[PDB]
């Protein structure tokens, strides 16, 4: 990685969608749902060739 | 209707309408941009101006936390973590190492 | 809370029950709970292994 940074659900400047995203992105990632998603999605055809 | 897009953003997005209660309508950009800050008008582009102007509430995509992002639009905490990295092709060439014994 | 000090700049996660409590900045750092174990011992291949 050359650096860090990562995806933010934008809202313009002084939406209240704000915080109540915020906490629900957290709530998502404490229970584990983030990861289901991500592994469900960027799963596929794992390479074999290397073997 | 908005039933033909899937994919990790689009399981995400009916998971926060659960949870704060909402119906969503998904509406594609058609500048077809993200956002980036011309240095000639002092404008914009795509996702990002879509939000200034008022012309949308959300914008669940692939749209990576910059400093010059959010000092227009307020973005949410990060739901994936990324960094920048470079692609190349696998090299499909052996090495020659003639001798091996 | 009870605004006694203004920031906490400290190793102070972003969690779920803390968010609704407290206002986080953005992160510093990336995390993540993972395991401290001892690594094994050493086999010391002898001289005379043949
Ligand atoms: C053990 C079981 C067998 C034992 C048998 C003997 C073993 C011990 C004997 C010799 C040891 C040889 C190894 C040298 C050291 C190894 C590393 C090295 O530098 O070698 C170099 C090669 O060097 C050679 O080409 C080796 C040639 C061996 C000829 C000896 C035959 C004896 C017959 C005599 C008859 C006289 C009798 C008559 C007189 C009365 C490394 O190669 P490189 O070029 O540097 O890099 C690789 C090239 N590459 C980059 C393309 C990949
Ligand atoms: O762009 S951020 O909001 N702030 C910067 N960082 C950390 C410094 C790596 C990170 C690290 C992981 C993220 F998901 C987001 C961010």
């Known amino acids: ?51 | 209707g908005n039933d033909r897009f899937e994919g990790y953003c689009i399981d995400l997005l009916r998971e926060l309408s659960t949870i704060l209660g909402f119906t969503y309508e998904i509406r594609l950009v058609e500048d077809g941009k993200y956002g980036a800050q011309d240095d000639v008008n002092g404008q914009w582009n795509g996702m990002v101006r879509e939000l200034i102007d008022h012309k949308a509430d959300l914008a669940v995509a692939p749209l990576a936390i910059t400093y010059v992002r959010e000092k227009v639009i307020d973005f949410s905490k990060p739901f994936m973590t990324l960094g920048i990295s470079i692609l190349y092709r696998k090299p499909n060439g052996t090495n020659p190492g003639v001798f091996s014994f």
């Open chain 1, 1 to 51: 990685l050359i650096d860090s940074k990562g995806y933010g659900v934008g809202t313009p400047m002084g939406s209240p969608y704000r915080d109540k995203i915020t906490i629900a992105i957290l709530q998502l990632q404490e229970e584990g749902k983030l990861h289901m998603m991500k592994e469900k999605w960027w799963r596929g055809n794992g390479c074999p060739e290397e073997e």
